[PDB]
Design a binder for these strands. Sequence first.
DNA 1: ATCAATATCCACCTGCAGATTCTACCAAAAGTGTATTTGGAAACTGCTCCATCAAAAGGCATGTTCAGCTGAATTCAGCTGAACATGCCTTTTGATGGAGCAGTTTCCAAATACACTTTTGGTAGAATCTGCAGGTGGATATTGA
DNA 2: TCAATATCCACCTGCAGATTCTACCAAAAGTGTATTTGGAAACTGCTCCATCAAAAGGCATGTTCAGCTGAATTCAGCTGAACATGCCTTTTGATGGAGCAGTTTCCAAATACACTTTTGGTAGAATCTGCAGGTGGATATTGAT
Lengths: 91, 94, 97, 99, 78, 84, 104, 108
Amino acid sequence: RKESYSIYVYKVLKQVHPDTGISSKAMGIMNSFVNDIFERIAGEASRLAHYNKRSTITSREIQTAVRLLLPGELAKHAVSEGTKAVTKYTS
Amino acid sequence: RSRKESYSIYVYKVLKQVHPDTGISSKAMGIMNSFVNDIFERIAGEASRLAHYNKRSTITSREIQTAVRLLLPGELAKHAVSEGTKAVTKYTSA
Amino acid sequence: PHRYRPGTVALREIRRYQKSTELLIRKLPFQRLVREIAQDFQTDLRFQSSAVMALQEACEAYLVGLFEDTNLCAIHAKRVTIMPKDIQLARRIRGER
Amino acid sequence: KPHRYRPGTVALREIRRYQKSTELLIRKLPFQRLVREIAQDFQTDLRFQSSAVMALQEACEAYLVGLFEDTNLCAIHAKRVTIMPKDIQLARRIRGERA
Amino acid sequence: NIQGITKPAIRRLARRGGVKRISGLIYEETRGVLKVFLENVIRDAVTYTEHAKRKTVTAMDVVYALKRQGRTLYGFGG
Amino acid sequence: RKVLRDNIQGITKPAIRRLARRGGVKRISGLIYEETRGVLKVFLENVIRDAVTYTEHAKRKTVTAMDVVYALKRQGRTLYGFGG
Amino acid sequence: KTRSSRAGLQFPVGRVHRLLRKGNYSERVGAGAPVYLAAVLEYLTAEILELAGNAARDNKKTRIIPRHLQLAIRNDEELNKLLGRVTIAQGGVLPNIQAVLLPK
Amino acid sequence: RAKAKTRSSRAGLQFPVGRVHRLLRKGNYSERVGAGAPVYLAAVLEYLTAEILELAGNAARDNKKTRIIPRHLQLAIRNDEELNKLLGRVTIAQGGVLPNIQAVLLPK
DNA sequence: ATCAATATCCACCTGCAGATTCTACCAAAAGTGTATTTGGAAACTGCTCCATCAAAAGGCATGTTCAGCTGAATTCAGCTGAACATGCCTTTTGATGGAGCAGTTTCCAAATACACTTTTGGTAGAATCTGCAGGTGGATATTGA
DNA sequence: TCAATATCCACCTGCAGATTCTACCAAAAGTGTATTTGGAAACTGCTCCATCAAAAGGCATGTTCAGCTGAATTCAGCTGAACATGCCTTTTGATGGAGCAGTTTCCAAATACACTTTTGGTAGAATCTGCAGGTGGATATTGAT
Ligand SMILES: [Cl-]
Ligand SMILES: [Cl-]
Ligand SMILES: [Cl-]
Ligand SMILES: [Cl-]
Ligand SMILES: [Mn+2]
Ligand SMILES: [Mn+2]
Ligand SMILES: [Mn+2]
Ligand SMILES: [Mn+2]
Ligand SMILES: [Mn+2]
Ligand SMILES: [Mn+2]
Ligand SMILES: [Mn+2]
Ligand SMILES: [Mn+2]
Ligand SMILES: [Mn+2]
Ligand SMILES: [Mn+2]
Ligand SMILES: [Mn+2]
Ligand SMILES: [Mn+2]
């Protein structure tokens, strides 16, 4: 069928605002958001690997992509969050 | 060492076809190479997107053609589509 | 009787509309306009209702944005009334003209 | 007389001249220093291919030149002939740059 | 049909855009811009339709058209 | 090697005037020159930041013309002529 | 025992992986790439939700709607920059009237 | 084995069909690439460079030069509505700008 | 209208950079033969997208009045354009280290590939509940006086 | 300042459309098992990026000096705003179908693989020639009278 990030957005919603809910129209907005950012990051990682003649996209490419796409503070935290998830996963 | 590919050779042939008498400086050839690479990427990119939006795994001349129609303005599109279709049917005709 | 001075009601509406999010163009007329233009690219097309809504949303967000840049252009010429030369200037700088 | 051109005459003479030519209008060495200064503040120990500095200059000059056209349009729109900081700001705002 | 987009509706749009006073010529001017905008978007959309060999314009077709015209829309499938 | 400072002033009044000329400007206010320098600074910084980001991702110490080309391209400021 | 739980994320790592592979981005994809990418997607999601949640709370409402996502984004310098060329449907605009237009 | 015929000649083109096919496969555009895709792409590319060289060459002639340089490429692009749109967000190094002075700026 | 001052053209020259053309090799593009899908058939099946009325309100289309905004005209205090004297520092040209990019060659740690083996995310109907939309009622804000 | 009109702002109120919630199934997603292979080390070869020297002269810096442009001030003719006044579409529902996106399943045609052959295309070299940079007069354009 059709798959979305809805379920995940909602789980994350409960962590930041347990008491808050979200209209479906707004859920649609969040999906568009997740999809868009995903494309942007994936797309830049794709180019980074191509410019450097590599056939694989590693956490290193996703990181530089994030660094090139997100404004200052957003980049730092995103970068923090990312390496944090990758280290924890490696353990 | 190592060789670097380019479209110079082809750009030069086409140049001779339209302007037998005319030459081109390397800087101008450098710009022509950027142009060819740019449009190539714009078209393949849009083609790749087209194929993906339609759950298709292969990029056929049909994708290249829609990409061209979406990318190029008016006349330019029409003429390019003509040359594109012409080359294909000629290519397939053995 | 009782009349509000020129502009007083104008400011009132700016406040109301900058506060709401409903589409400001009558729905039927819009759908009618969309199909007419589409008919020129391919005949007998059907439209997903959500497709028409996406167009009206994009279209209204675009005009509203364009009206902001236009207002700025008019304020620049030390006026308070927007004019075609204002919409024209803004579209040129934006690279649409 | 001594002969003397009226203000504006030489300016138009300069517009016709520079729109006629393609060379870079900012001096090379100074521009190179600006690049190295800015780069250095982001990252130390950086060196540059000469064409990289020239690509940056070509880019900055095309950018400023195009910005001055919009700036010029904003001034004319205000019934003026002299570009002012406010015009450059209106242009960058509408262009969606800093806004 | 373009005339269907009425003066009072254009006024509202302008109001959401913070415009206080409007010259009489703005209405027709606005319509022309509106039309160019819709023609460009719809043309690209129907091109996605015709490619998918469909006869129905989908919200995704529009969303894709918008995206490539630099007018990314959120809320209709991307 | 000497310290680098105030190089933005290397973008002289005469050079800014020339650029405005090519841009078709006839009359220039006295405050234009500092605004221009400011505007150019921001433009350069952004392109250099992305360019240097590509350099570092490539583990290089040298910024290449391609680095700048990719930096410009991603800023919607595509440049022809140094692509090779 | 899913990768998301191992990475300590609420976002679908396995799916981000599958999407990266089927998106024609590269010939191969590292094991950590989807982890990283998913962490980044989750963090921005929480960031928006946090602010749109505050926006709803300030409107004395408990359900986040489009208007709230628009106020959270446009009122935030960085998110605004990131979504500068994006339009949130049914989100309206920020209240803002140019001074010169004010009366008296 | 058999008479080696390039796909370009078979297609009636100057531009490299093989090269273009290769670029497609190695560009991560799609899992598979049809045989007609590079042929159609090489032809569009060749047509577009023919169109701008035609105009650039004329610009050169008008400036009494036999060798095309970047400025000639600028004139050709900026003076043609369609190419100008197509390359509307591109900058040609060493191309300059089109001579153009707003009327209000000229001596009354 | 007229000069005269000064800024353009407009060919005419000729050696250099830079183009072109000439050669020698591979890195690729071409053949062939062999598995592997791709995705365009024709037949059906539930959406869901029009065409159909209805009936209202709304919301839009029409004058009326006149408030106050936008130009037009006038004035003038400098700001910013020429022109000129000075001489600084960017340009030009080699001449050198080496810092550090690319090539070539190893291999492992890290991806595919593949059959299974659970699991989770979706979808189609259960139970609710956050607010839209209305309401008297109470200050506000805006105006004419 | 005063009196009053029409506009907001509120605390309540209550269905109702849109939300959390229920209860099962396939298409992932997680697992072992080789099978591969991309691309960090390790070196070197050898571009080309800093630095430096030394010599001009193009072009930046500062000043004068005053033309004419940006900005106030006025002023009044209209253009738009505010407002009833009617009246014509847009809106809101329920069909009732009919058009058609979505599968199914099928294979003939169209790629993807593999493994050699066969050359078109990329360095450098050698060879070739537009035109940059100078000059000296024909217009041409400006600005004072
Ligand atoms: Cl106008
Ligand atoms: Cl200013
Ligand atoms: Cl990885
Ligand atoms: Cl094909
Ligand atoms: Mn010809
Ligand atoms: Mn000095
Ligand atoms: Mn070394
Ligand atoms: Mn479950
Ligand atoms: Mn309410
Ligand atoms: Mn290998
Ligand atoms: Mn004076
Ligand atoms: Mn004036
Ligand atoms: Mn009056
Ligand atoms: Mn049917
Ligand atoms: Mn050969
Ligand atoms: Mn010359």
